[PDB]
C-alpha cells in the first residue's frame, strides 16, 4: 500500500506519523547499514521534516525502554532491522 | 560478583551515575537476557531508584541517536551487550 517494509512493536505517535516514521527509518536503512548511522541521519531528516530532536534507536537485536514522553514515539521492525523513534518534546 | 562488566562509548551523566548505571544495566541483565526486558528492568530501577524519567536502550547490535540532556545519558556496551541511558530532565 505505502511501503513500509517494516514491524511496528510499540508506537505512541499517530498512525500516519508511524507509517512515515519506519519509511524515513528505511532511507537510512537503504542508504546505510550502520545502526547509529541510519538513527543519525534520520533524526536530522524528522527534525528538519518535523521539528528537532528526534531521539530514535534504530538497531537490529536490541532493546530500547525510552519514554517517548511525547507524541511521536514509534517503535518497528524492518525486512531486518528495528527502530525506535521518539522525540523528548 | 562484581558488575559494570560493560564498555562505555559515550555517556553524559555523573560519574558514579554511570557506573551505577551499567551495574543496573547489568542487573536486568543476569535477571534476564531479552533486549527489551534488561531495558526495561534498568529504566525501571533507575526511574524509582533515582528520579523519572529514564529512558535506555539495551542491545547488542542497533544504533542509538537520540538528542540526550539534563545529565543521566550513559551509553555503553557489557561483556556481550550495550545500555542507552538517557532521561529528558
Given at each position: 500500500m505505502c511501503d513500509?517494509?517494516?514491524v511496528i512493536k510499540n508506537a505512541?505517535?499517530?498512525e500516519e506519523m508511524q507509517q512515515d516514521s519506519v519509511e524515513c527509518a528505511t532511507?537510512?536503512?537503504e542508504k546505510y547499514?550502520?545502526?547509529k548511522d541510519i538513527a543519525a541521519h534520520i533524526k536530522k531528516e524528522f527534525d528538519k521534516k518535523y521539528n528537532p530532536t528526534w531521539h530514535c534507536i534504530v538497531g537490529?537485536?536490541?532493546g530500547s525502554y525510552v519514554?517517548?514522553?511525547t507524541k511521536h514515539f514509534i517503535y518497528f521492525y524492518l525486512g531486518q532491522v528495528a527502530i525506535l523513534l521518539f522525540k523528548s518534546g
Open positions: 513500509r517494509k517494516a505512541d505517535m499517530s532511507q537510512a536503512l547499514n550502520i545502526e537490529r537485536n536490541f519514554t517517548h514522553e
